[PDB]
Swiss-Prot record:
UniProt domain comment: Forms a beta-barrel structure that accommodates the hydrophobic ligand in its interior. Can bind at least two ligands per molecule, however, the stoichiometry is debated.
Highest taxon in the source lineage: Eukaryota
Protein name: Gastrotropin
Membrane topology: Peripheral membrane protein
InterPro entries named among the record's database cross-references: Calycin (IPR012674), Fatty_acid-bd (IPR000463), ILBP (IPR031259)
Keywords: Acetylation, Cytoplasm, Lipid transport, Lipid-binding, Membrane, Transport
Protein source organism: Sus scrofa
Residues carrying N-acetylalanine: 1
Annotated gene: FABP6
Taxonomic classification: Eukaryota, Metazoa, Chordata, Craniata, Vertebrata
Function as written in the Swiss-Prot or TrEMBL entry: Binds to bile acids and is involved in enterohepatic bile acid metabolism. Required for efficient apical to basolateral transport of conjugated bile acids in ileal enterocytes. Stimulates gastric acid and pepsinogen secretion.
First-listed, main subcellular location of the protein, grouped into a coarse class: cytoplasm
Record-level GO cellular component terms: cytosol; membrane; nucleus
Keyword hit for Metal-binding: no
Expression tissues: Found exclusively in the ileum and to a lesser extent in distal jejunum.
Length: 127
């Protein structure tokens, strides 16, 4: 039930996640809260997701419910994944990039996780 604009206003664990994720120090330090606008669109059961740092970099993805998709989150780490959806909550699972998203209380809740360290994150809606 995404289909809308979203703003991201907080994350939790950009030091432990990033240590393992593997970014150089300057990138880690600025990421602390380089703010991001997020947005999603859907056709029938084909989702089109989009997170955008104002900076040149962006994390755009596109995937189907059920069936199968591929992800390339930060860079040089293409994955394969069988997105599924259960309740009003999408999940995705990858060799080393679990991810999920959720709608509750007219808000968008979201996570990313890597077999040990999690990176819960939350977002506002604006459409």
């Amino acid at each position: 039930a995404f289909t809308g604009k979203y703003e991201i206003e907080s994350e939790k664990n950009y030091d432990e996640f990033m240590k393992r994720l593997a970014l150089p120090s300057d990138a880690i330090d600025k990421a602390r809260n380089l703010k991001i606008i997020s947005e999603v669109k859907q056709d029938g059961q084909n989702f089109t997701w989009s997170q955008q740092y104002p900076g040149g970099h962006s994390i755009t993805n596109t995937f189907t419910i059920g069936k199968e998709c591929d992800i390339e989150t930060i860079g040089g780490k293409k994955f394969k994944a069988t997105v599924q959806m259960e309740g009003g909550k999408v999940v995705v699972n990858s060799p080393n990039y679990h991810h999920t998203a959720e709608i509750v209380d007219g808000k968008l809740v979201e996570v990313s996780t890597v077999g040990g360290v999690s990176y819960e994150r939350v977002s506002k809606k604006l459409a």
